[model samples]
Target chain A: PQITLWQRPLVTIKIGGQLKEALLDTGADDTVLEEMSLPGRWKPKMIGGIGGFIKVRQYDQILIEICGHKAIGTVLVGPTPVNIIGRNLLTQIGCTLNF
Target chain B: PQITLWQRPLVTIKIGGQLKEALLDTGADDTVLEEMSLPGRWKPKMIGGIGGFIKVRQYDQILIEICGHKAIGTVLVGPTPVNIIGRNLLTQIGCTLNF
Candidate 1:
């Protein structure tokens, strides 16, 4: 019997002026960061998307160096009880999962 | 330099799930909602506070009201563009804003 496992890529984020590691999840539609981890001086702002218009503030986009791949993207700032690596970001990096 | 002006308090949140109304910011050390407005079976967990073990979750805490001024604390779905009301939340429910 043989089994297969799915593997995803890990990315780094700059929070509170510090670099942090995060998982890349293409299934998610936007970049979701934990609000609690946000740094000071950053303000919140509402943005528009497929769901009409919602309120989201810009924290900061950090340099993500993954497997020699790198790109910068905006991060949502707020106390998110959960950590998510969504699609809005994954697609930008062209990531594919291997099962 | 002489300048003084302060006023705050407003509440109402519910994306995708409906229920509208905004303007309730309570200093917001936590509870920041946005990121595409999540909804669907709802399955995510990990929660903590202060500055220790991060990686929090546990969505779904609605009551159509908040803080006894109504008492409904749970709204941090996804894709938040902008629009926020803060500090006022803490001051309202005896959240003292001692300067």
Candidate 2:
């Protein structure tokens, strides 16, 4: 199903053999998951947020399934307040802004 | 012109008698603007972000014009990294997420 501005635009996602909910964040440059472990070596990177910066483990080529769409790319795992699906994953899902 | 997700969803907006650019953030619950001054009294409030939370001056019944559409509602001004047009303002412009 599609989403509108009146709603929060939360969708169910599957990653690392687990189902979770994530907020579709168009404002974020990268997708950030909370406390998830991947099966590969990741680079330590810091992402800037409204409050400040946070160190995160960035894993490349991580598969994410959201809204019946699957995308494989970089995924950042850190101490985020919420799981965010950014443009990196949103683009793959063909999610577009309509007015 | 309409906006799509592939293009970062950036739009030109006019707020508080000044023109600015803001991100069309579906994940954000409240519209957040960068440093600026408003015409009316505002309350001090804080909103949560990725890293943490920051204090914002919340003004009610502010007129925000975006892409030829105008909306009058609550607007939060804070020391944000970027100006974000959250769901609070997006709804007035009829922004929808279509796949």
The best candidate in terms of DockQ: 2
The candidates' DockQ values read 0.02, 0.77
**Residues A9-97, model 2: lDDT tens digits:** 88899998899999988888899999978999999999998889999999999998997788988999999988999988888887888
TM-score of each: 0.33, 0.96
**Which docking band does candidate 2 fall into?**
medium
Task: Give a tens-digit lDDT track for model 1, residues B54-81.
Answer: 3323355533333334434454433333
Residue B12 lDDT, candidate 1, scale 0-100: 57
Candidate 2: where is the Cα deviation over 4 Å?
A: none
Query: Candidate 2: which pairs clash?
Result: none
For model 1, the docking class works out as incorrect
Instruction: Give the chain B TM-score achieved by candidate 2.
Output: 0.93
True contacts kept of each: 0.00, 0.84
Ten consecutive residues with minimal summed lDDT in candidate 1 chain A? A1-10
| Number of colliding residue pairs in each model | 45, 0
lDDT of 1 at A21: 65
